Amino acid sequence: IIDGAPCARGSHPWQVALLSGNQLHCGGVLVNERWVLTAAHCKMNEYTVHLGSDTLGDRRAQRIKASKSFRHPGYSTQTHVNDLMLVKLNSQARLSSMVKKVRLPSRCEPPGTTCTVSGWGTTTSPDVTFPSDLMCVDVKLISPQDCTKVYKDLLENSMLCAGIPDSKKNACNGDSGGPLVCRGTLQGLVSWGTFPCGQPNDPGVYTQVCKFTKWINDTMKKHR
DSSP: OBSOEEOOTTSOTTEEEEEETTEEEEEEEEEETTEEEEOGGGOOSOEEEEESOSBTTOTTSEEEEEOEEEEOTTOOTTTOTTOOEEEEOSSOOOOSSSOOOOOOOSSOOOTTOEEEEEESSOSSSSSOOOOSBOEEEEEEEEOHHHHHHHHGGGOOTTEEEEEOTTOOOBOOTTOTTOEEEETTEEEEEEEEOOSSSOOTTOOEEEEEGGGOHHHHHHHHHHTO
16 A cells, blocks of 8 residues: 555454465455455465454464455456456354454445555555555545546446545555445455556556446355
């Protein structure tokens, strides 16, 4: 997360981290006791899922293995369209004040809405600085029309753009798959942006969760 600050402790109980070799690989969100929602870009054969702590490396956190994942079939590595994946936990997440399900959206939030993106990704770019504590930043939803001026026809209607005018405030490598929350609901998953990160007036691009409700629910049902 670029130009943010540590999240208030206990305010992101639905946030998870996907680890590989005890290093941060991606962010993600807890959907229910069995399922993590993240970016299809985060695909691995095995995951170690961190839950229940704002601190990576915290002994108090749950560490659950996951051997099954399902990327949305429309996912493209060329264009990052349909950048979403469900990760099936090997054992159920044990819920508490530090481990809760995210509220999935019914509606899409309009452009101009204030949102919060969170993650353990680098706070500097190109030089890397991975924090221990979960970082937060407030961004605003940007219209597809304004976002098209920067990314042209690489943008699809399933993607959501967010940022602040003339600001470095954004998500970066490590935050991928993480949550963008607007008005109590999950509206996006960190997908892509420019590199180096935190370039002013280059919006962060997210998978627009409200367009993928049916697939999310059907997939969890199918692979229960």
